[PDB]
Amino acid sequence: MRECISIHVGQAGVQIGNACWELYCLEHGIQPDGQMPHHHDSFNTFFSETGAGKHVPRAVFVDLEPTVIDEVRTGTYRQLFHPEQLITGKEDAANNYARGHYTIGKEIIDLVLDRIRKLADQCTGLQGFLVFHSFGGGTGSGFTSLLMERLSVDYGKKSKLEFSIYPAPQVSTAVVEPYNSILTTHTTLEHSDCAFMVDNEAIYDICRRNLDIERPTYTNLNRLISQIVSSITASLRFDGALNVDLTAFQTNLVPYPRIHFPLATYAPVISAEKAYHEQLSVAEITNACFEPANQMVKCDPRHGKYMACCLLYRGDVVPKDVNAAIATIKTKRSIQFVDWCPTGFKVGINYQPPTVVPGGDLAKVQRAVCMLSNTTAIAEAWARLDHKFDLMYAKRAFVHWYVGEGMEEGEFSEAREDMAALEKDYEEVGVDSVE
Amino acid sequence: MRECISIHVGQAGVQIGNACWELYCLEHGIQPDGQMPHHHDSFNTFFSETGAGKHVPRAVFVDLEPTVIDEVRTGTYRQLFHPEQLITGKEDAANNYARGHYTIGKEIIDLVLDRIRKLADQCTGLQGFLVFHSFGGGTGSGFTSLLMERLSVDYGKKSKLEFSIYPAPQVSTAVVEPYNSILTTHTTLEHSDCAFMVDNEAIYDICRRNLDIERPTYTNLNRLISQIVSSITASLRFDGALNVDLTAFQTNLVPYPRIHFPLATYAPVISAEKAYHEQLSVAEITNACFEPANQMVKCDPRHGKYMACCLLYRGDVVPKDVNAAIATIKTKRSIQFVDWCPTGFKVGINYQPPTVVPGGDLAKVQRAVCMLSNTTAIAEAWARLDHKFDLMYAKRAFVHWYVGEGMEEGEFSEAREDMAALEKDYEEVGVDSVE
Amino acid sequence: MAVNVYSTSVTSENLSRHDMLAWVNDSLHLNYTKIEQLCSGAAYCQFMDMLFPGCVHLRKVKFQAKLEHEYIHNFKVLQAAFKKMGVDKIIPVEKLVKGKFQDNFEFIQWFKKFFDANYDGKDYNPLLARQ
Amino acid sequence: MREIVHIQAGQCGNQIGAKFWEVISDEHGIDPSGNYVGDSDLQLERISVYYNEASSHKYVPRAILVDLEPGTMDSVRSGAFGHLFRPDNFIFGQSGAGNNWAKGHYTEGAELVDSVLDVVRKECENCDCLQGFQLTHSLGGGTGSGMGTLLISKVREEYPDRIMNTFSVVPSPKVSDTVVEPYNATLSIHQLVENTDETYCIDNEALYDICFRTLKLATPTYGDLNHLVSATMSGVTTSLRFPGQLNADLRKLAVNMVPFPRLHFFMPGFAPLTARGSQQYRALTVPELTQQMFDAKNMMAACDPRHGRYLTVATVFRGRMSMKEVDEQMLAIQSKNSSYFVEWIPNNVKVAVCDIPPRGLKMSSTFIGNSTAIQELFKRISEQFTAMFRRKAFLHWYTGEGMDEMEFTEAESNMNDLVSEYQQYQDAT
Amino acid sequence: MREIVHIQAGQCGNQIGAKFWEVISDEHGIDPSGNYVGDSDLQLERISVYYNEASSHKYVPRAILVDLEPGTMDSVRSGAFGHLFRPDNFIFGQSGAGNNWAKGHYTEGAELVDSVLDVVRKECENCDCLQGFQLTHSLGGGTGSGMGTLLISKVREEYPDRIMNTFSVVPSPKVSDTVVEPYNATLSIHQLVENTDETYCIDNEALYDICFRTLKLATPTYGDLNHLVSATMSGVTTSLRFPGQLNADLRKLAVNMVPFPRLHFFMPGFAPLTARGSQQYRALTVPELTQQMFDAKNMMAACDPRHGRYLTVATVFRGRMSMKEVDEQMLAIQSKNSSYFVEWIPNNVKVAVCDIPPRGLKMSSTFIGNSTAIQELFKRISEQFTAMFRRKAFLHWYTGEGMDEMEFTEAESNMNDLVSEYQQYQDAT
Ligand SMILES: Nc1nc2c(ncn2[C@@H]2O[C@H](COP(=O)(O)OP(=O)(O)OP(=O)(O)O)[C@@H](O)[C@H]2O)c(=O)[nH]1
Ligand SMILES: Nc1nc2c(ncn2[C@@H]2O[C@H](COP(=O)(O)OP(=O)(O)OP(=O)(O)O)[C@@H](O)[C@H]2O)c(=O)[nH]1
Ligand SMILES: Nc1nc2c(ncn2[C@@H]2O[C@H](COP(=O)(O)OP(=O)(O)OP(=O)(O)O)[C@@H](O)[C@H]2O)c(=O)[nH]1
Ligand SMILES: Nc1nc2c(ncn2[C@@H]2O[C@H](COP(=O)(O)OP(=O)(O)OP(=O)(O)O)[C@@H](O)[C@H]2O)c(=O)[nH]1
Ligand SMILES: [Mg+2]
Ligand SMILES: [Mg+2]
Ligand SMILES: [Mg+2]
Ligand SMILES: [Mg+2]
């Protein structure tokens, strides 16, 4: 009765979808063939039910290149997905926001909107859309921008969360990431009800340091992101001592309409060999969360301010211990709050412990914590992109690919001033008041 | 709930740590895998407890050469330790205080401080730190000096005990021990709340004479030092007729802030073959303690004065016999007290008898005694080092290694004047006052 | 920039309770009679003000503080000032806020050491800063 | 005779209500199925105050459960003591107010307020002689705060002369469980000061401190805190559902405890409270309870009464005890405590006594304190409000639901006026 | 009627208190579970002096246990006769004062003094008619000395007209169990002379000598020494908890034994004391006890009374005796030792007689002696104080906790003034 659909755009989006839906199928005891051999109907959120015992997910996998979609189709999770929600194009946007937003995206946007409308029309209490896309690829950025526009125009006021792969400061895979990232940020700034920044380099650092995996693959990063999203949706999908909804996320984390960019952190992240030797007290995991190393973005909060924080605990969590740990964090030195906000913590509790994936890397624990923090240091990251953009815009590099594709230089300018204005707004929010 | 953590610096620190933690695991009935198949939670002092029955030590093993740490990791006590506190460097300081205090020590000091803070933050009544290091190696001396600085700056007033391997008068293994010893002493003189000197030659002599082991190894010396440390911590870890805390040690043994260098002695030390044939009365073992041969430093107290003494008894000890023995000791001729201290005895009593390690060298006894004496003859030892230093400083030998590694000649000089000032302070304390 | 010091064990340099109380009273022109009242933290903020011009903003500190959260807020301001000047001595706010003799005296003696370290010889009126 | 309709709003409201109804079922000896398995007629002689007699000798609670998310309702239904509620009273929403007071009072609450009011109207018509209503909710979340404010406003506009109780959880001073609780608390206290005859301020921090210190529970779940809140509920209400050597009801406490219509913000307290092992080491006599009540560590509000003055003090007792002794302890605790009591209210203590102890315990008490210290609470919130109102922080959410800044200004002004009245009556002589 | 609150400070205080409460439980016939298992009503007719009657016919002692290290508290809890103490009274610190009087009186003791005083206040309010306080501590360790001094100060400032007893272990002359006990003893004696109505100086050396010679015990544990101290406690207090042909209490002994307010330092003694085998070889008659008391070897203080003068002497008896024989023995012992008693106090002997003998004995006694010989003790400590104060020995430890040298100087001056007063009153004619 409480429905919330997922939209995975781009190759990164589809791989996150693989991980997340593997985790969901494990959580609700669903075989890959859709059968079922602290729990309410918990699965009614993500899983719609047919006449038989088969359950199918309410998700849309869209990508212009058939590679990853064919891999999903021929993979183990073949019978599960309804064949319509595996939507494929012909040619990839190739790291070009132009190709993914004006020329190729339009050729299949109507089908995606139609399938989304079919999914929505048979729901009863749809809360919103979980959008998984990257800012690097042209497909992700451009098609996500177009889709957010279309959904906002079609659906009026529904929470639309973006779980993006923000481009890393130094470890980049493409060359034209700055252009695409600036364009997609400028486009989605007025549709993204709340966007959660995630960076690849920080997850690499976390995995090497904590998981002790000297050579991890994208599978593990997908596993961590799936754990994050499961922690986010645990309150909706399970009984909890203190429940929280998506609108609560959108309300407690966004002080100003233009500043809606929280960052995520998960704990604990320890291997089975290191599962013992330490008890995972709630204070311990909370200190691990507020430690700048366990953060999933290369931005250190200790040179900024915390506008808001949202902590979600799951498992055998004792609320008084929550209160004690939060007070101790409040007393610390590396957490200085902004002037206008004397109260920046939200707490949510769920009884259901996190679920361990067989063949995974983490260890089965009894308590888990996700921190969703809206802080000020993230603004610094934007500056870097701007600088890069300006450098790449100093000599008009790579501009022709966009220009000859249904694109104008004027939006490049306009996006640049919009990014500068966002930075100015962040800086203004940072400062303290008179009297 | 009464916690006290251990910090083992240098190869000697790690080996004495092996011995001490073997002794502890035997004392509290802990299998090497951390399970438990006159006692309070006695083990709660050294051993933190996990969700299961596994117990892990609150100690930090730090050493720049990974050899000894690998031996610990691959040894029998593998599963016991939490893998984080086995911290390794990459290259050893190589008997160079400069390398162990300015160049290499800085590269891992932050991790050590972070782990120490993590250990401390989950304690409740932390009393202090037991630091096991040598003055000979560059790693031990330099890194211990740096770590004492950082701990003093970070933690305000917690007792910090140093059980150092003081360089022997004639039996040396290095050539640059004087420089490192003076540098580390001058550095730690302002942070060592109490430093307990122990010498290798004296322990060799004790092992040859009493244990009748014609060819002892470092294992035996580590066993003796571990027995001393266990006798020190028995009052904290066990029920006693007269308990004593670390602050009591720091208070009763330090008359002047600069003179805080007691020496240790243990009794009885007799083999199983010689375990019989004598009843080991408290008077007998006390006489053995005050005998100059059983002391663990090559300094004979009969040419100095006793500023203070602290005797800890454990086992089936009857206090009246303690009083009678102490009176008889006071009556003897070879113990002349300083003028300003008419009462230089502290006594502590514990019910728990000493624990015998299987495969060891000592014999299971019913009474045991540790003598911790702050006397004046120890000053003589310092003079020797000074002479050596001046000799090695006469021709500027080995200076370039320190100079080209981030050290100033003025540091060597100021250490020399500070050491001479310490000798003058010892001398002026030694003399008697008028009227 | 400011230099930093420590306090472990020194003789002839540890000042008495009443002496330090008179020191703070004379340096801030006020009449504290209990040293644990310095759990309020206003005295520390005004000490930071006199130690470095600016470097703080006394409008947020609450000189009329009488509760625990007010103490926490004042100590947050103090921690911000400490971070600004680069002094890295982490302060134990959790024990200080309770207003108990031990940690307050420990903190104030360390603060006396640090204050003697970083003071020049300027003169001013504490009242104008206080109001 | 003298029936009471119980309303629960917000997740904390439903949880407190579930524990409360468990306590009442224990007191009146009712199975979860709803049958009577007691052993004394007195349990049934006033069963009608909270329970409606259905057919086949079955008793159902006269409770209304309101929320905007089905998770809480599913939790209540699934667990034990869930079958006795009437399934029609299970009114719930779908999306949840999302910690936003607008959706709880203007947007989402508007879609269920009509159904809730029809159910309340039906229950009022079905009851014999209505006494009043009591609401259990919180001021932190959007749902409970906004929906409770709306329901109280509509009900009092539907029933002017009835009395309405609210047991509202007030946010803790040190920590905040939410982020935008200043606005919600300000608006909710505004609605309460307009249209409530008394409220019992309750704070999670105070309950945590009491349970850790007095109860010696190192691991306190919400179960125990809700149990203490329910015990306070039952101790307040016991004077109406059972006889006593000095009978009282909600009206008597309201009249004695409210000297000025705006000042109706009270603090609850309970006694005795003992650890599991330390129970037999003490004789449960009247002066022990009296000395246990009048202290900060047993007050469920996060404000020391010695920061202010005690205006009035209500003490309800349960169990066979001598009246002279209760009177003597009240006289002594007033005489030795002349400083914290208002001078221009001679004999500022109300005493009520029942005959039925609270299960397992030989006798117990219940403390209601009308003191001005709570104004500090308001000041803190007020300050935080300004700190979050000066830069227009999170206001665009509440403006996007149609409300204006003028309500925020007016409500802040009214709370400041309430603080001023508390201060003035504190300074009266 | 005439209730006494017993406080225990330091590890010595807790151990002596444990043995003392065992002795009292034996006297009043109380199960360690706390039930009454006696056989005579007289045991219960004055049970309330030390025991509070909790519910279900259970009795719990009116004792408070204070320390800064949990080892002693755990030892008391684990062993037998441990379930009787009320669990909240087990007030203890965590780190221990570390033999430092500053931490016991200023730094650490301030962290528990408030809780201890609240417990004392609750007990005083709960008692019917308070008589006075008795403290068991030592002057050697930092914890017992400092905490006891602080508690005595605060309690007497809270209750001026009450009487307060201290049974403080004084360091032995031959050996020192600690190193810095001169300062601790000096400051503690300063506090005691300021704010105590009497103290019983007790020394380990004297008990060792007594047990070795008189008791013929070659292996005396602390159990036996604490047993003798507890027996002295019970013998002093027995005149209040049981009838007698000549009843007394603490007030009568305080008035008779203290001719000048400062001079309130006494020495205890017990009789009869016999070896295990030599018990039946001697008739227990009043004279035999009389010459057993008046001699150095049965004096628990390390000071020979023949070195000085006897100012006043209290003698308490227990067991069926003829009063004439007691009076004749007292007159004879005063007459034949006329050199040793002050001339300007004619009839300087107080006699009290109870009705109930002690354990496994037909009759027994208890000796309190106010004599000037103890001044030697003080002088010795004073000299040692100077010997450790002229060169600033260990002073920086007490300087680092905030004390000033003027405090040490003033305490030394007051102690020397006390020595001078003893000398002068000894030389009076
Ligand atoms: N963390 C993480 N990032 C991924 C993963 N897969 C792809 N990415 C990100 O995606 C970026 C590559 O661009 P994509 O968005 O995948 O491009 P696309 O979706 O294939 O669309 P085209 O650009 O037209 O090919 C890289 O910079 C990665 O950071 C993944 O499995 N885990
Ligand atoms: N008594 C005793 N002394 C030891 C033992 N192991 C090492 N030492 C002392 O340590 C000195 C050698 O220098 P170390 O401190 O071990 O040097 P290190 O810790 O390996 O660090 P580097 O100098 O950089 O290699 C010798 O002079 C020994 O006296 C031991 O097991 N027992
Ligand atoms: N005493 C007590 N308070 C509780 C308990 N559970 C929750 N609370 C309080 O209730 C508040 C939770 O917000 P609610 O008013 O319940 O909000 P909601 O009903 O979940 O509605 P939404 O916020 O829109 O999701 C928290 O701030 C807690 O302080 C409980 O079990 N006992
Ligand atoms: N008569 C008697 N005296 C004892 C006994 N146990 C300890 N003492 C005395 O008490 C003193 C012990 O010091 P305490 O006052 O107990 O110090 P503490 O309570 O342990 O506190 P810290 O010194 O800080 O550890 C010693 O000097 C002993 O002379 C005992 O069983 N019987
Ligand atoms: Mg692609
Ligand atoms: Mg080495
Ligand atoms: Mg809700
Ligand atoms: Mg002690």
UniProtKB/Swiss-Prot annotation, chains A, B:
<feature type="binding site">
    <location>
        <position position="134"/>
    </location>
    <ligand>
        <name>GTP</name>
    </ligand>
</feature>
<feature type="binding site">
    <location>
        <position position="173"/>
    </location>
    <ligand>
        <name>GTP</name>
    </ligand>
</feature>
<dbReference type="GO" id="GO:0000278">
    <property type="term" value="P:mitotic cell cycle"/>
</dbReference>
<feature type="active site">
    <location>
        <position position="248"/>
    </location>
</feature>
<comment type="function">
    <text>Tubulin is the major constituent of microtubules, protein filaments consisting of alpha- and beta-tubulin heterodimers. Microtubules grow by the addition of GTP-tubulin dimers to the microtubule end, where a stabilizing cap forms. Below the cap, tubulin dimers are in GDP-bound state, owing to GTPase activity of alpha-tubulin.</text>
</comment>
<feature type="modified residue" description="3'-nitrotyrosine">
    <location>
        <position position="276"/>
    </location>
</feature>
<dbReference type="GO" id="GO:0005737">
    <property type="term" value="C:cytoplasm"/>
</dbReference>
<dbReference type="GO" id="GO:0030705">
    <property type="term" value="P:cytoskeleton-dependent intracellular transport"/>
</dbReference>
<feature type="binding site">
    <location>
        <position position="246"/>
    </location>
    <ligand>
        <name>GTP</name>
    </ligand>
</feature>
<dbReference type="GO" id="GO:0031625">
    <property type="term" value="F:ubiquitin protein ligase binding"/>
</dbReference>
<feature type="short sequence motif" description="MREC motif">
    <location>
        <begin position="1"/>
        <end position="4"/>
    </location>
</feature>
<dbReference type="GO" id="GO:0003924">
    <property type="term" value="F:GTPase activity"/>
</dbReference>
<feature type="binding site">
    <location>
        <position position="222"/>
    </location>
    <ligand>
        <name>GTP</name>
    </ligand>
</feature>
<dbReference type="GO" id="GO:0005874">
    <property type="term" value="C:microtubule"/>
</dbReference>
<dbReference type="GO" id="GO:0005200">
    <property type="term" value="F:structural constituent of cytoskeleton"/>
</dbReference>
Swiss-Prot record, chain C:
<comment type="function">
    <text>Plus-end tracking protein (+TIP) that binds to the plus-end of microtubules and regulates the dynamics of the microtubule cytoskeleton. Promotes microtubule growth. May be involved in spindle function by stabilizing microtubules and anchoring them at centrosomes. Also acts as a regulator of minus-end microtubule organization: interacts with the complex formed by AKAP9 and PDE4DIP, leading to recruit CAMSAP2 to the Golgi apparatus, thereby tethering non-centrosomal minus-end microtubules to the Golgi, an important step for polarized cell movement.</text>
</comment>
<comment type="similarity">
    <text>Belongs to the MAPRE family.</text>
</comment>
<comment type="subunit">
    <text>Homodimer. Heterodimer with MAPRE1. Binds monomeric and polymerized GTP-bound tubulin. Interacts with APC2. Interacts with DCTN1 and SRCIN1. Binds to the C-terminal domain of APC. Interacts (via C-terminus) with CLIP1. Interacts with SLAIN2 and SLAIN1. Interacts with AKAP9. Interacts with PDE4DIP. Interacts with PDE4DIP isoform 13/MMG8/SMYLE; this interaction is required for its recruitment to the Golgi apparatus.</text>
</comment>
<feature type="domain" description="Calponin-homology (CH)">
    <location>
        <begin position="14"/>
        <end position="116"/>
    </location>
</feature>
<protein>
    <recommendedName>
        <fullName>Microtubule-associated protein RP/EB family member 3</fullName>
    </recommendedName>
</protein>
Curated annotation (Swiss-Prot), chains D, E:
<protein>
    <recommendedName>
        <fullName>Tubulin beta-3 chain</fullName>
    </recommendedName>
</protein>
<keyword id="KW-1017">Isopeptide bond</keyword>
<keyword id="KW-0966">Cell projection</keyword>
<feature type="binding site">
    <location>
        <position position="69"/>
    </location>
    <ligand>
        <name>GTP</name>
    </ligand>
</feature>
<comment type="subunit">
    <text>Heterodimer of alpha- and beta-tubulin. A typical microtubule is a hollow water-filled tube with an outer diameter of 25 nm and an inner diameter of 15 nM. Alpha-beta heterodimers associate head-to-tail to form protofilaments running lengthwise along the microtubule wall with the beta-tubulin subunit facing the microtubule plus end conferring a structural polarity. Microtubules usually have 13 protofilaments but different protofilament numbers can be found in some organisms and specialized cells.</text>
</comment>
<feature type="binding site">
    <location>
        <position position="144"/>
    </location>
    <ligand>
        <name>GDP</name>
    </ligand>
</feature>
<dbReference type="GO" id="GO:0015630">
    <property type="term" value="C:microtubule cytoskeleton"/>
</dbReference>
<dbReference type="InterPro" id="IPR036525">
    <property type="entry name" value="Tubulin/FtsZ_GTPase_sf"/>
</dbReference>
<feature type="binding site">
    <location>
        <position position="12"/>
    </location>
    <ligand>
        <name>GDP</name>
    </ligand>
</feature>
<feature type="binding site">
    <location>
        <position position="144"/>
    </location>
    <ligand>
        <name>GTP</name>
    </ligand>
</feature>
<dbReference type="GO" id="GO:0005874">
    <property type="term" value="C:microtubule"/>
</dbReference>
<keyword id="KW-0479">Metal-binding</keyword>
<feature type="binding site">
    <location>
        <position position="99"/>
    </location>
    <ligand>
        <name>GDP</name>
    </ligand>
</feature>
<feature type="binding site">
    <location>
        <position position="204"/>
    </location>
    <ligand>
        <name>GDP</name>
    </ligand>
</feature>
<feature type="binding site">
    <location>
        <position position="15"/>
    </location>
    <ligand>
        <name>GDP</name>
    </ligand>
</feature>
